[PDB]
Design a protein around this ligand. Structure first.
Ligand SMILES: COC1=C(OC)C(=O)C(C/C=C(\C)CC/C=C(\C)CC/C=C(\C)CC/C=C(\C)CC/C=C(\C)CC/C=C(\C)CC/C=C(\C)CC/C=C(\C)CC/C=C(\C)CCC=C(C)C)=C(C)C1=O
Ligand SMILES: Cc1cc2nc3c(=O)[nH]c(=O)nc-3n(C[C@H](O)[C@H](O)[C@H](O)COP(=O)(O)OP(=O)(O)OC[C@H]3O[C@@H](n4cnc5c(N)ncnc54)[C@H](O)[C@@H]3O)c2cc1C
Ligand code: HEC
Ligand code: HEC
Ligand code: HEC
Ligand code: F3S
Lengths: 539, 413, 135
C-alpha cells in the first residue's frame, strides 16, 4: 500500500495534532505518523505511582513513559544516552522528550505563554539575536485560537510588567494561589520582584469536557484526571474527524523530484519494514531535535547536505532557556504543593533596555510537593521514631525550589550533527548537540545568581544548594531558523521550507528567538499559521 | 418573573426546545433519542413564519394538551402532552401569553423528524392516544389533602412530568399507571424508583436530603447525572423553596412499589474494607497503553482513584462523591453506574459546574473498552456498591448503543 | 508466625500501630528474597527488645549502636517509610499513598497523584508545623 493522503504530518505532538485537527476540520484528508506508540494516561499514572520515591524527589519526568527501542526518547536517571550532548554547557541541553501519540506535551507543565512584541523584533530593537519573519500582530489571532483550543487560564483582570497585550481576555481566569505561591509573592514583592500568575493550559473550571484541576500538583509528568492540556486531546479529536493515525512509524527518508518538491516519504515500523507514503503536502512536526535530525538523515542526491539544507542551517542556531536551580530550607513554612506545579513566576525582567547587553530572565518558584524529597532526605539522615516524623514534616513544610531561566541567542555553532558513534534499533543515528551558553547568558546569570541569593536570604534559607552548571528547560527551539532570505533561513514566514515548496515545518525549530518563557504556545500558534497556509495552498 | 415564565421554567419546556447550551432558546432543533429514531423539537419562539407566532389560544392549548398541531397533524409522544393534558386553563393561558410576548422570535427552521415506517406518518397516533387513555379533565385540588400535597402532585405530574421518565412504559410505549413512579429505562440512563418504598425507593431518604437533591442535585448519598443533570440545571434549581417542599411532601405520599430482591436502601450499602495491591503493579511498569491491566482493582486505582479515594469514600469536602453508600453504585440495576462511567456527570447549578470526565470510547482523558469498564464497575459494585449487582461487557455495549431496544421498535425493520 | 513477628517489629520500629498487612507481607517476602537469613535477624532484634525492655525505638536506636543489627533495623524503617528496599531506579515500590513518609504532611501537602479535598482547597490556610496530624 502507498498510503495516499492529502496531507501527511510526521509527528503526533501538540503541533502535529493541532495542525491535523485544524486540517480535518476543513475537509482535508490527513495522515498522522508518529514514531512512538499509543499511550494511555491511566497507565502512565500507574507507572509514576510505582516509580521509586527517589525518582519522584529528583524530578524524573521520563520513567513513567517507557522508551521504545525503535523510537527511543531521553531518560536521564539511568541516562540512556539517546541524546549525546557536548560543549562547555552540555548539561544545559539534556532536554526531555517523549515519543508517542501526544508527544512531549504528555508530561509538560502546561505553561502556555504569549511572547512579547519585542521577542519578534529582538534584533531590530536591541541588536542581538535574530528577527522573526513575522510580527506579534500577525500571530495574535493564532495565539488566541490556540489558547481557546487548549483552554489557557490566566490573570484576566490584572496589570503586568509587559505581558504580550491581548485583544481578548483569557478563556478562563487564573485559579487562586496556594499558600506557597502567596508567601513567595509577598516575599519577592518585599524584595522588589513582581510575582504574577503563569498563564496555564489548565482548567480553573470544567472545560472541553475535562474536569477542573483538583490540585494534584503532578502536572509534571502526568495529571491523573486530565485537567491540563495534552497533545493527545488534539490527536483524538483529529482521529474522530477522519484523520488516520499510524503509531510506531519512524520516518527515515524523503524523495524529491526535479523541482525539489517532496513527492513521497518512507517510514519504518518496529520490524524495520519500509512503507511508502505519498501526499500532496508534507509536514514535519516532530521536535526541535527530531525535525532537524530527520532533515539531515534523509539527505538525497539533490540535497546532499540534508532536506531543506541549502543554507547549511538545519540543526544550527539551537536555543533553549538555560536555568539555574536552587534548593534550600526556608525559615518560615512555605507548604509547597497547593495547586499546580508552576503557578507563578517573576516576569519583572522579561523585557528592558538591558537586553542589548545581557539576557533577560524569568525567575520562578517551583510548586511541586516536597513530601517525597523531605521523606527521602530525612531517611538519609538516619533518624528514627518521633524525630523522623518531625523532620519529615519540617522539611516538607520548609522545602523551597527556585529556578531562573535565561534567553540564549541563536548561535550557528550549536549544531545537531548526526552522531557517528551511536545508533538505535533501526540504525538511525542518535542526535548530537554541541551546546554553548554564550557570553549573553553568562552575563545574565552573573546577575541572576545574585537575585537567587537575595531571594534565599529573604526567606532566611538554610542548606542553600545551587546548581554550578546550567540546567535545561525543554524549550527546544531553533534548528530550522525562519526568515526572509533563503540563504539565511530554512523556512519563510508561513513555515514553508525555501528549498521545497511542498514541505512545511510546524515545529518549534522554526522560531528565531528562544524568548524568556516557555514556547509551546508559540509553537501551537505557528502550527495554526501553517495550517492556514496549507489550506490556502490546497484550495 | 411573570406567572407564564415561572410555569415555563417549571414545565422544563426550555430543556427540550433549546438545542443544548447554544442555539438560542425555544428555537427547537434538539434531537430526542426516541426508541425508534430521533425526534427533533419544533420551533416555539413566536415567529409568524418559522415558529408558532400564528397560533391562537385554542390552537396552542390543543398542541400543548391534546398533542394536535395547528394544521391538524398529531404531535409525537416526545411531547409530554399526556402529562400536560391536566394543566389548568389559566396555566395554559399564562404559558401562551409568555410564549407570545416574553420570548423574542427566532426565524430559523428546525430539522424535520424523519421516522421509519410505520412511524413515518403522524396519523396513526390517534389510535395510540386512544389506547393510552391520555385524555383527562384539567387538574383540580383534592380537598382530602392539604394545599401543599395538591401543589406537589400538580408539579410532579403536570408541570415537571416526573412520571415521563420515572414511570415504566407498556408494550405500546404508553405510561404504565400500575407502576407509578416505579422506575424506568429511558435509553442509556435508568430513572430509579422514587416511590415511598423504604428499601426499593426513596422512602428512607431524609426530607432535608431529598429537598437538597431536588434543589441542587448534590447530596452526600446521591448526585444527579444525565437527565437529572439537565432537569435540575434547567428547571428544578429555579423553582421556589415552597415548590420543592410541596414536591417532597407529595413524594412522601406516593404508594410504594417494591423491587424484586431488595434488602437495604440504595444508599445504605457499606463499603468493603479492601483495595488493590501496589506491589502487584510493579510488573506492569514499562507497559504503557494498559491492555495487560485486567485487574479490576488496579484499573479502578489507575483511572478513578485519583478523585474518589482508594477506599471509595471520596474527598473530605464532598466535591468528589463517596462511592461507598452512593445510590448510583448501590442500585441493584447497574445501568446508572455504567452510564456514569461511559458519559460522565455534568451539572451546572447556580452557575457552578461539576464535571466527571467521560470514560467511553469518545473520552479525551482516558478511553476505556467494554471489558475494562465492566471490570471497573464490577470492582466498584463488589467493594463500594451493591454486591449482588454485576456488569458484563455486553451490558456496557448495550448501554453504549442506547439501552435495550423495545420490542415495538423492532417492528420497523 | 514469621509474618506476625515482622509486623510486631515493624510496629515497634516505626512507632505506629496501624500498618497495612498486605504491604507488610510483601515487604517481608521481598526482604527474605533479598536476604536469606532475614528472619534470624528479626528474631534477634525482638529478643533484644524483650531482654532490654526498650520503651520505644528511640531508646533501641540510642543503645545497640554499632551492633550488626542496626543496618537491618534501619532498612526496615526505610522500607516502611519510603516503600522501597533498594536504591536503584527500577526498585519495586511496595507502598505509595500509604508509605509512612507521606503521612506527617498528609493533612496539608497533597500526596501528588491522589487529590486532596476539592478543586480549590489550597485557598484555606495550612495547619501549624508543630502539630503531628495522626498515626
Ligand atoms: C400503523 O398502525 C399502527 C398504529 O396505529 C394503529 C400504531 O399505533 C402503532 C404503535 C406505535 C406507536 C404509534 C408508538 C409511537 C411512539 C413514538 C413514535 C415515540 C414514543 C415516545 C415516547 C414513548 C415518549 C417517552 C420517551 C422518553 C421519556 C425518552 C426520554 C426522553 C428524555 C430524557 C428527554 C403501530 C406499530 C402500528 O402498527
Ligand atoms: C518536563 C517538561 C515540561 C515542560 N513544560 C512546559 C511548560 O510548562 N510550558 C511549555 O510551553 N512547554 C513546556 N515543555 C515543552 C513542551 O513539552 C514542548 O515544547 C512541546 O511538547 C513540543 O511538542 P512538538 O509537537 O513540537 O514535538 P513533540 O510533541 O515532542 O513530538 C511530536 C511527535 O513526533 C514524533 N516523532 C519524532 N521524530 C519522528 C520521526 N522521525 N518520525 C515520526 N515521528 C517522529 C514523536 O514520537 C512525538 O510523538 C515541557 C517539556 C518537558 C519535557
Ligand atoms: C420531578 C421533578 C422529578 C423528581 C421528583 C425526580 N425526578 Fe428523576 N431521575 C432521572 C434519572 C435518569 C435519574 C438517575 C440518574 C443516575 O442514574 O444517576 C433520576 C434520579 C432521580 C432521583 C434519585 C434516585 C436515586 O438516585 O436513587 C430522584 C429522587 C428523582 N429522580 C426524582 C430522570 C428524570 C427525568 C427525565 C426522564 C425527569 C423529568 C425526572 N427525572 C424528574 C424527576
Ligand atoms: C472510575 C472510572 C470512576 C468511577 C467508577 C466513578 N467516577 Fe466519579 N465523579 C466525579 C465527580 C466530580 C462527580 C459528581 C459531579 C458533581 O457532583 O458535580 C462524580 C460522580 C460519580 C458517580 C455518580 C454519583 C451519584 O450519581 O450519586 C459515580 C457512580 C462515579 N463518579 C464513579 C469525579 C471523578 C473523577 C475526577 C476527579 C474521576 C477520575 C472519576 N470521577 C472517576 C470515576
Ligand atoms: C414548556 C412546555 C412546552 C411547550 C409550551 C411546548 N413544548 Fe414541545 N415538542 C417537543 C417535540 C419533540 C415536539 C414535536 C414532535 C411531534 O411532532 O410530535 C414538540 C412540539 C411542540 C409544539 C408543536 C409546534 C410544532 O410546530 O410542532 C408546541 C406548541 C410545543 N411543543 C410547545 C418536545 C418537548 C419536550 C421534550 C424535550 C418538552 C419538555 C416540551 N416539548 C415542552 C413543551
Ligand atoms: S495538570 Fe491538573 S490534575 Fe492537578 S496535577 Fe496539575 S492541576
Amino acid at each position: 500500500e502507498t498510503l495516499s493522503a492529502d496531507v501527511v504530518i510526521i509527528g503526533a505532538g501538540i503541533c502535529g495534532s493541532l495542525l491535523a485537527h485544524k486540517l480535518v476540520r476543513n475537509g482535508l484528508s490527513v495522515l498522522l505518523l508518529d514514531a512512538g506508540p499509543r499511550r494511555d494516561r491511566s497507565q502512565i499514572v500507574e507507572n509514576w505511582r510505582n516509580m521509586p520515591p527517589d525518582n519522584k524527589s529528583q524530578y524524573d519526568y521520563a520513567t513513567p513513559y517507557p522508551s521504545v527501542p525503535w523510537a527511543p526518547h531521553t531518560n536521564y536517571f539511568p541516562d540512556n544516552n539517546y541524546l549525546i550532548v557536548k560543549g562547555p554547557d552540555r548539561t544545559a541541553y539534556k532536554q526531555g522528550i517523549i515519543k508517542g501519540v501526544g508527544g512531549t506535551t504528555w508530561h509538560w507543565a502546561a505553561s502556555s505563554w504569549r511572547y512579547l512584541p519585542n521577542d519578534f523584533k529582538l534584533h531590530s530593537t536591541y541588536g542581538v539575536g535574530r528577527d522573526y519573519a513575522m510580527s506579534y500582530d500577525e500571530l495574535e489571532p493564532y495565539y488566541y485560537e490556540a489558547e481557546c483550543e487548549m483552554g489557557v487560564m490566566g490573570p484576566n483582570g490584572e496589570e503586568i510588567t509587559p505581558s504580550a497585550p491581548r485583544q481578548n481576555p483569557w478563556p478562563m481566569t487564573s485559579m487562586p494561589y496556594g499558600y506557597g505561591d502567596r508567601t513567595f509573592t509577598e516575599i519577592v514583592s518585599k524584595l522588589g520582584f513582581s510575582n504574577t500568575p503563569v498563564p496555564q493550559a489548565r482548567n480553573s473550571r470544567p472545560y472541553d469536557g475535562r474536569p477542573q484541576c483538583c490540585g494534584n500538583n503532578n502536572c509534571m509528568p502526568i495529571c491523573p484526571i486530565g485537567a491540563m492540556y495534552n497533545g493527545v486531546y488534539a490527536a483524538i479529536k483529529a482521529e474522530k474527524l477522519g484523520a488516520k493515525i499510524i503509531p510506531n512509524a519512524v520516518v527515515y527518508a524523503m524523495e524529491t523530484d526535479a523541482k525539489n518538491r517532496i513527492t513521497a516519504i518512507s517510514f519504518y515500523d518496529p520490524d524495520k519494514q519500509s512503507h511508502r507514503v505519498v501526499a500532496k503536502t508534507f509536514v514535519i512536526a516532530a521536535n526541535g531535535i527530531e525535525t532537524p535530525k530527520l532533515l539531515l538523515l534523509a539527505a538525497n542526491d539533490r540535497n546532499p547536505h540534508g532536506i531543506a539544507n541549502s543554507s547549511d542551517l538545519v540543526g544550527r542556531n539551537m536555543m533553549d532557556h538555560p536555568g539555574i536551580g536552587m534548593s534550600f530550607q526556608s525559615a518560615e513554612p512555605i507548604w509547597a504543593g497547593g495547586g499546580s506545579v508552576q503557578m507563578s513566576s517573576i516576569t519583572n525582567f522579561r523585557d528592558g533596555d538591558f537586553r542589548s547587553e545581557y539576557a533577560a530572565t524569568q525567575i520562578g518558584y517551583n510548586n511541586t510537593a516536597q513530601n517525597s524529597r523531605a521523606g527521602m532526605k530525612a531517611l538519609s539522615m538516619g533518624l528514627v521514631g518521633k524525630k523522623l516524623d518531625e523532620e519529615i514534616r519540617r522539611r516538607t513544610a520548609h522545602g523551597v525550589d527556585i529556578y531562573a531561566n535565561h534567553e540564549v541567542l541563536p548561535d550557528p555553532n550549536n549544531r545537531l550533527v548526526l552522531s557517528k558513534d551511536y545508533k538505535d534499533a533501526l540504525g538511525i543515528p542518535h542526535p548530537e548537540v554541541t551546546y554553548d551558553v554564550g557570553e549573553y547568558v553568562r552575563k545574565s546569570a552573573a546577575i541572576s545568581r545574585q537575585r537567587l541569593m537575595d531571594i534565599a536570604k529573604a526567606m532566611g534559607g538554610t542548606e542553600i544548594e545551587m546548581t554550578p552548571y546550567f540546567t535545561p528547560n525543554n524549550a527546544i527551539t531553533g534548528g530550522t531558523i525562519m526568515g526572509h532570505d533563503p540563504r539565511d533561513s530554512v523556512v519563510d514566514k508561513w513555515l514553508r521550507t525555501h528549498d521545497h515548496s511542498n514541505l512545511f515545518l510546524a515545529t518549534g525549530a522554526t522560531m528565531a528567538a528562544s524568548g524568556t518563557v516557555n514556547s509551546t504556545l508559540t509553537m501551537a500558534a505557528l502550527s495554526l499559521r501553517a495550517a492556514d497556509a496549507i489550506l490556502n495552498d490546497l484550495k | 418573573i411573570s406567572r407564564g415564565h415561572y410555569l415555563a421554567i417549571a414545565a422544563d419546556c426550555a430543556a427540550c426546545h433549546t438545542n443544548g447550551r447554544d442555539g438560542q432558546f425555544l428555537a427547537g432543533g434538539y434531537a430526542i433519542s426516541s426508541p425508534m429514531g430521533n425526534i427533533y423539537s419544533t420551533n416555539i419562539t413566536p415567529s409568524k413564519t418559522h415558529g408558532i407566532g400564528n397560533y391562537t389560544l385554542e390552537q396552542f392549548s390543543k398542541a400543548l394538551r391534546h398533542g394536535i398541531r395547528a394544521d391538524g397533524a398529531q404531535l409525537y409522544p416526545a411531547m409530554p402532552y399526556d402529562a400536560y393534558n391536566r394543566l389548568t386553563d389559566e396555566d395554559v393561558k399564562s404559558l401562551y401569553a409568555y410564549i407570545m410576548t416574553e420570548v423574542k422570535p427566532v426565524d430559523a427552521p428546525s430539522p424535520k423528524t424523519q421516522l421509519p415506517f410505520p412511524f413515518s406518518i403522524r396519523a396513526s397516533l390517534g389510535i395510540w392516544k386512544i389506547a393510552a387513555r391520555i385524555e383527562g379533565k384539567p387538574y383540580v385540588f383534592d380537598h382530602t389533602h392539604n394545599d401543599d400535597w395538591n401543589r406537589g402532585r400538580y408539579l410532579v405530574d403536570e408541570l415537571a412530568h416526573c412520571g415521563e421518565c420515572h414511570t415504566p412504559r407498556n408494550f405500546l410505549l404508553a405510561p404504565n399507571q400500575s407502576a407509578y413512579l416505579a422506575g424506568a429505562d429511558i435509553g442509556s440512563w435508568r430513572a430509579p424508583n422514587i416511590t415511598n418504598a423504604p428499601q426499593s425507593g426513596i422512602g428512607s431518604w431524609s426530607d432535608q436530603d431529598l429537598f437538597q437533591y431536588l434543589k441542587t442535585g448534590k447530596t452526600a448519598h446521591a448526585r444527579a447525572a444525565g437527565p437529572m443533570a439537565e432537569a435540575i440545571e434547567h428547571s428544578l434549581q429555579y423553582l421556589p423553596d415552597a415548590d420543592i417542599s410541596a414536591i417532597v411532601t407529595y413524594l412522601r405520599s406516593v404508594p410504594a412499589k417494591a423491587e424484586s430482591g431488595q434488602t437495604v436502601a440504595n444508599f445504605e450499602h457499606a463499603g468493603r474494607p479492601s483495595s488493590y495491591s501496589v506491589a502487584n503493579a510493579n510488573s506492569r511498569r514499562s507497559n504503557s497503553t494498559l491492555t495487560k491491566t485486567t485487574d479490576g482493582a488496579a484499573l479502578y486505582e489507575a483511572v478513578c482513584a485519583s478523585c474518589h479515594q482508594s477506599d471509595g469514600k471520596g474527598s473530605k469536602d464532598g466535591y468528589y462523591p463517596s462511592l461507598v453508600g452512593n445510590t448510583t453504585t448501590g442500585q441493584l440495576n447497574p445501568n446508572d453506574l455504567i452510564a456514569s462511567i461511559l458519559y460522565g456527570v455534568d451539572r451546572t447549578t447556580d452557575n457552578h459546574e461539576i464535571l466527571m470526565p467521560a470514560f467511553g470510547p469518545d473520552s479525551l482523558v482516558q478511553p476505556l473498552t467494554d471489558e475494562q469498564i465492566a471490570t471497573i464497575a464490577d470492582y466498584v459494585l463488589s467493594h463500594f456498591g451493591n454486591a449482588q449487582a454485576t456488569v458484563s461487557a455486553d451490558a456496557v455495549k448495550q448501554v453504549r448503543a442506547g439501552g435495550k431496544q423495545v420490542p415495538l421498535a423492532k417492528l420497523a425493520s | 508466625d514469621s509474618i506476625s513477628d515482622f509486623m510486631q517489629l515493624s510496629a515497634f520500629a516505626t512507632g505506629h500501630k496501624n500498618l497495612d498487612l498486605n504491604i507488610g507481607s510483601a515487604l517481608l517476602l521481598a526482604f527474605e528474597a533479598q536476604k536469606h537469613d532475614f528472619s534470624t535477624q528479626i528474631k534477634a532484634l525482638r529478643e533484644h527488645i524483650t531482654k532490654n525492655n526498650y520503651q520505644d525505638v528511640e531508646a533501641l536506636d540510642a543503645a545497640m549502636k554499632d551492633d550488626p543489627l542496626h543496618p537491618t533495623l534501619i532498612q526496615i524503617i526505610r522500607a516502611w517509610y519510603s516503600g522501597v528496599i533498594e536504591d536503584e531506579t527500577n526498585a519495586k515500590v511496595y507502598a505509595f499513598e500509604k508509605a509512612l513518609m507521606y503521612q506527617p504532611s498528609r493533612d496539608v501537602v497533597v500526596i501528588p497523584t491522589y487529590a486532596h479535598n476539592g478543586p480549590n482547597y489550597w485557598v484555606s490556610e495550612p495547619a501549624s508545623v508543630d502539630v503531628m496530624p495522626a498515626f
